[PDB]
């Protein structure tokens, strides 16, 4: 038993972290198959990131201007070009180390892990959720650009973050692998805010349902409720509209524990409307939302 | 900026997880040059485990009763010893992916990473600290045991945990990688209990120390207090005799912040007579204990 905030083994994706170089910039690559992936901003300076024409800067860059570093092993870059808010440095020589992957964008509310690095050297793993806002919470310093988050489904790596900004409210901004950034945020260095930061209703139930198989079982109560009530009640607390998908998704977890979805919902009604009393659940004092019905039954099982 | 529970990148060690057989049992195994460590009870039955003699169940087990599997190639075992409780089965190949590694005991307050293990494969990893009962709060299931804990500094990997037992507690119990349990518990299914467990109190003070770092200061005060008269509000509480050589390791926190550690025990201090009124502090409504000194300057660093 137990129940512990967990993070997928990393192994995988060190084999892919090499450090590229553009001038005066360093951050991290990632090295899959011939391909080197990392953020654009590399080409900028720090007076750059005022307002970058990002293009404009790459027409001066050439293939010799990218050092990509896989330890003492020096990459050779053939070919270079622009998509989106990365970088894809052709090199001549395949990573050996590349494991089965995809480039996944993630839905908000889901969960990854992450791999902080610097200088293209692991230095940690945690886990991380993409918040409704499109932003994450993790930890990242100066030379984290280019650190990866994933999940591994068995054999295959799912790649599906790249670090890019801290936002001046502490909160970090990415891409997927594909450039895309999560949410209204810009590779610049502007004033950018999140929106209101709502809570992962579904993620919440399914911490709830991991307690009950734990032993913390004071937060069930004799009450039940309205899908249309409960998101009254959400609404209010900043929580996520819960909808029928979400319902199915806790299905298992609710079958396994023998508790309806809306007897959980109304439980977690009364936690929303009396709090925790100076109680705890899982060893924790708030309500966590990184956890999704995916994440409970992989620990669980 | 940010701030995370983190653990260490895995990929050292999950080169090193092997699967172990006998019998009926199987559990997981740390396979460092020719040499593959495993708790001894991997020779017991469900029966056994209510009390079992481990000399005259080794008795019966020769070296073909050792099923040692790295994926799809079989190790050969060419001799078995038991050190204390765990089993050195030397193998004839040694493993190429061994790192450079130590054999550590760890402190009582001490952090180390836990890669969770099944049939040999890692499932995830996760941040653990020895509580001062000699006891971990892990995500630990059936099949669970082998599963080591380690820390890696720069090159060298130093082991320091492996997982026997889950008390009827809810919490886990284990050896370090010489065989000796960690505590007053045995291999053997009984009623075993942990003292009361004490909070770290050096490690809560370092993460208040991270907590300043990162923007979170509402919990600074205006109050001092000495060494001995936050011992007695400490003792109160359960919390762990605060010294002086806490007092120093907290040096380079203290200087880099500008608050002195004794100022840092005041507001400690009202944070455990006063609570903490509904607010977080770098995210979590409760002390956080689990972070020690260095894993600070790590994330900060
Ligand atoms: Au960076
Ligand atoms: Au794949
Ligand atoms: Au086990
Ligand atoms: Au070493």
Same mark, same amino acid.
């Given at each position: ?204 139930? @399914?911490? /709830?349902?991991?307690?009950?198989? +734990? $032993? ?10 309205? #899908?249309? =009530? ?35 919902? @109304?439980? /977690?009604?009364?936690?929303?409307? +009396? $709090? ?10 708030? #309500?966590? =939302? ?12």
């Amino acid at each position: 038993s137990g129940f512990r905030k967990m993070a997928f083994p990393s192994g995988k994706v060190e084999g892919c972290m090499v450090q590229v170089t553009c001038g005066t910039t360093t951050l991290n690559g990632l090295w899959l198959d011939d391909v080197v992936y990392c953020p654009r901003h590399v080409i900028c300076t720090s007076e750059d990131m005022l307002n970058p024409n990002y293009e404009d800067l790459l027409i001066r860059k050439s293939n010799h201007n990218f050092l990509v570093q896989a330890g003492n092993v020096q990459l050779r870059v053939i070919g270079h070009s622009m998509q989106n808010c990365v970088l894809k440095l052709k090199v001549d020589t395949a990573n050996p180390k590349t494991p089965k992957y995809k480039f996944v964008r993630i839905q908000p509310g889901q969960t990854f892990s992450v791999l902080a690095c610097y200088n293209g050297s692991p230095s940690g793993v945690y886990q991380c959720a993409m918040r409704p806002n499109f932003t994450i919470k993790g930890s990242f310093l100066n030379g984290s650009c280019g650190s990866v988050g994933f999940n591994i489904d068995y054999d295959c790596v799912s790649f599906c973050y790249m670090h890019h900004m801290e936002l001046p409210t502490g909160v970090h901004a990415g891409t997927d692998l594909e450039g895309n950034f999560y949410g209204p945020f810009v590779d610049r260095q502007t004033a950018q805010a999140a929106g209101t930061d709502t809570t992962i209703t579904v993620n919440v139930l @399914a911490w /709830l349902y991991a307690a009950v198989i +734990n $032993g913390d079982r004071w937060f069930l109560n004799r009450f039940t409720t309205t #899908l249309n =009530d409960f998101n009254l009640v959400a609404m209010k607390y900043n929580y996520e509209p819960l909808t029928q998908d979400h319902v199915d998704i806790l299905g298992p977890l609710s079958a396994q524990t023998g508790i309806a979805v809306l007897d959980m919902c @109304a439980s /977690l009604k009364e936690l929303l409307q +009396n $709090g925790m009393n100076g109680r705890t659940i899982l060893g924790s004092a708030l #309500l966590e =939302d990184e956890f999704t019905p995916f994440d409970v039954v992989r620990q669980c099982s």
